[PDB]
Design a protein around this nucleic acid. Structure first.
Length: 180
DNA sequence: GTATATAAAACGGGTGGCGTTTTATATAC
């Protein structure tokens, strides 16, 4: 082994606590998009940490694109400050990470059909529909996308340890189904 | 486009329970 998964995307939610006028928000922000007809939220962005926020009239906000939990909270506080600077009585509350995505490379090809047959109740593999095997782990409850190349995607985690836990648990199985 | 996780909530549609839609990301067909 020796491989440890790399975090790729962190999704979080934040309650600003006050109602927002989206045209005002979009108008005053330096990096905003807002087309009511397409989606009901201002799509705001900041350069550091590089992230994207979906800002709603209710004052709720979704922050995505961060590569670390630190970066997620940091960028979230920053978006909240922007809203304040524009003039609303916003508050940075209820910061919570909802989804963590990770990925790695085991460095060997995998026999997906064998794995799907062996771990049938957790696996779903339809190569004509999507080339990767969808593995639904029980403990921890994580979803893994397994590819012939040996590249692995882990998602559905609320905490970093779950990403790490799942990979540790899957590695022996990937080894059992290697090609070379 | 296909598939995976996840929140936010307005829209469409017919006056309603709920599917779609958007955003970010790895991955590969």
């Amino acid at each position: 082994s020796g491989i440890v998964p790399t975090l790729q995307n962190i999704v979080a939610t934040v309650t600003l606590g006050c109602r927002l006028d989206l045209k005002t928000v979009a108008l005053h922000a330096r990096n905003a998009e807002y087309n009511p007809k397409r989606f009901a939220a201002v799509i705001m962005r900041i350069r550091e940490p590089k992230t994207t926020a979906l800002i709603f009239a209710s004052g709720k906000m979704v922050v995505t694109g961060a590569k670390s939990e630190d970066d997620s909270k940091l960028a979230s506080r920053k978006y909240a400050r922007i809203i304040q600077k524009i003039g609303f009585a916003a508050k940075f509350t209820d910061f919570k990470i909802q989804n963590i995505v990770g990925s790695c490379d085991v460095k060997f090809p995998i026999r997906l059909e064998g794995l799907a047959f062996s771990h049938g109740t957790f696996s779903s593999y339809e190569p004509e529909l999507f080339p990767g095997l969808i593995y639904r782990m029980v403990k921890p409850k994580i979803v893994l996308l397994i590819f012939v190349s040996g590249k692995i995607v882990l998602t559905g985690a609320k905490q970093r340890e779950e990403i790490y836990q799942a990979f540790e648990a899957i590695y022996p199985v990937l080894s059992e189904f290697r090609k070379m």
